[PDB]
Design a protein around this ligand. Structure first.
Ligand SMILES: *C/C=C(C)/C=C\C=C(C)\C=C\C1=C(C)CCCC1(C)C
Ligand SMILES: *C/C=C(C)/C=C\C=C(C)\C=C\C1=C(C)CCCC1(C)C
Ligand SMILES: *[C@@H]1O[C@H](CO)[C@@H](O)[C@H](O)[C@H]1NC(C)=O
Ligand SMILES: *[C@@H]1O[C@H](CO)[C@@H](O)[C@H](O)[C@H]1NC(C)=O
Lengths: 326, 326
């Protein structure tokens, strides 16, 4: 056969030699070379010793300063959290795995891995809708001045977690389930088995349609719009040129956080999807492992685009470290 | 300078030599080589001697036959019309142009060219929404059985023309305007000049947002969905396998008419857009001419995808010509 199905796992390696061991009992060294299983550990070790400070620091250059309290400093201080939940919640429990070539903590771990990745990913796709909608109600402003108050900011921030849990938690109680992917060292929604005691095929397309399509239809719609105004719906709507440089410094950043999201995450999907529909067609333990581990940088790059494309945040962040000021 | 603006035209060639003539008074042979202006004529002559029968024939294999009366035979018998409006309404008035190297009929023609192209394109982008929504209410069917009758079919067919005229007619009365593109032998909405006596900048993004973005957001949303069911939302919703081959023979075609639309039309946009925002940056008479003439095949290929991907239609179409039956 192609893979070797079990009670709670699936793998791209034929038990036609009877070698296959379940990814919860013994090493999966029979999938790739033992020099690679360490490579993951090293990569996963780098993102742990890189995501911890550049997200704890952004989760701190805000809590201290005062003038840093607008809709943007909120969403990027919210990623400052969702991401650290990725590191100690997921990455600690994922690096540790590769060093062993297979999960050890019992499936009672492939829940923190697969949960704290799906979670950090969803709080990052939805936090982008609340950011587009924000760029939309600021770039080509609609009606009366119910101007965003620190208030509606929380409303959208408490919004991402909620929505982001509608995708991640369901499979944690029994609406799908987290199972080992590619090399059995990265767990994600069971796009693998057809199982029926969790309606696997339902939750899966549920997840995809409200936490991929929709999430986007709101971003794309508010995308172009972030261009009508950076032109004529602005000449008539009179906008001082001392604001079409900051308010655009942000229309640019938001615009690069969206692309940045489609570069990193789309790939994992390219495979997660091909998997689902073409179930039963031989593939290896690298067909879903790169996209996974690659896309897994979803908890590192945002605080960066943010120090490299947002001066205000950057002049303060350099004021914190250097003590006093610059 | 870059181009040589006039009262009702715009061109990518510097009057820094004083050569430039208006695309409504004398030949524009000074933009490309006179061997090319004929090339357009020949290309435009081929699509005229190719789109006339394969659209008059589909606009006839339906009007006669009886068993050809369902939502799909309607939308593809509607393109059978919008397209012939492209040929004699637009192409006759556009081939004739290139043989002369510049418009002759007076701008009182760059209205039929630029109108009967925008029109044929809008009756084809919207007829795809009415086709996705249809695949959507048939692939992952919603509730109670109000199963469409020939009725709602017209509702959506009378729908495309209406919506498609919201894009094309406006510029014809004074909300934008049709002006010569690239080689002054293909007219399209004025993505060129900033003008103000037609609010050029408003209509343009209007046209883009409701006749590009939206039109798609309905197609894309109904796209994936055309996959939930071609899987599990169909096992529980019990669908005989003698229908999951015709009803899918159509989920495939519709799916190839959407890709086919993004291959052909997207390019013209890629430039029409870069033009608008980057107004004033030198470019030539080929930067907007290929996409235009290329994408201009939007009145030829659908009746084809239709004879090559829909057997019923094809077995009858071959029955008409061969007289009697096969
Ligand atoms: C490193 C391990 C990972 C990334 C494991 C699992 C990931 C998911 C279940 C991801 C889900 C998705 C997200 C967060 C965003 C785009 C759509 C998606 C379904 C692939
Ligand atoms: C050959 C000449 C042509 C195609 C001239 C003009 C075309 C337009 C004004 C096209 C408009 C568009 C359509 C039909 C569909 C996609 C979006 C669009 C605005 C480019
Ligand atoms: C095949 O794999 C299974 C489950 O992973 C294992 O228990 C079994 O012993 C292998 N086949 C045989 C014939 O031993
Ligand atoms: C430049 O172009 C214009 C109009 O297209 C033409 O009328 C004019 O005569 C040319 N320049 C000169 C100096 O003649």
């Amino acid at each position: 056969m192609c893979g070797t199905e079990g009670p709670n796992f699936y793998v791209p390696f034929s038990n036609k030699t009877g070698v296959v061991r379940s990814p919860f009992e013994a090493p999966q060294y029979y999938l790739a070379e033992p020099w690679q299983f360490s490579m993951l550990a090293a990569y996963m070790f780098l993102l742990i010793m890189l995501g911890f400070p550049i997200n704890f620091l952004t989760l701190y250059v805000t809590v201290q300063h005062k003038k840093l309290r607008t809709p943007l400093n909120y969403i990027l201080l919210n990623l400052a959290v969702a991401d650290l939940f990725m590191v100690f919640g997921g990455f600690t429990t994922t690096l540790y795995t590769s060093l062993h070539g297979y999960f050890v903590f019992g499936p009672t771990g492939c829940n923190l891995e697969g949960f704290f990745a799906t979670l950090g990913g969803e709080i990052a796709l939805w936090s982008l809708v609340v950011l587009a909608i924000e760029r939309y109600v600021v770039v080509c402003k609609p009606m009366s001045n119910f101007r965003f108050g620190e208030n509606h900011a929380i409303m959208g921030v408490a919004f991402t977690w909620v929505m982001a849990l509608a995708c991640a938690a369901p499979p944690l109680v029994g609406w799908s389930r987290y199972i080992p992917e590619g090399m059995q060292c990265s767990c994600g929604i069971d796009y693998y088995t057809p199982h029926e005691e969790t309606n696997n095929e339902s939750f899966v397309i549920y997840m995809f349609v409200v936490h991929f399509i929709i999430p986007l239809i709101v971003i794309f719609f508010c995308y172009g719009q972030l261009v009508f105004t950076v032109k004529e719906a602005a000449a008539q709507q009179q906008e001082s040129a001392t604001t079409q440089k900051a308010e655009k410094e942000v229309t640019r950043m938001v615009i690069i956080m969206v692309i940045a999201f489609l570069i990193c995450w789309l790939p994992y999907a390219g495979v997660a999807f091909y998997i689902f529909t073409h179930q039963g067609s031989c593939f290896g333990p690298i067909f879903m492992t790169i996209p996974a581990f690659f896309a897994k940088t979803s908890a590192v790059y945002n605080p960066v685009i943010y120090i490299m494309m947002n001066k205000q945040f950057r002049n303060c962040m350099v004021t914190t470290l250097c003590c006093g000021k610059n």
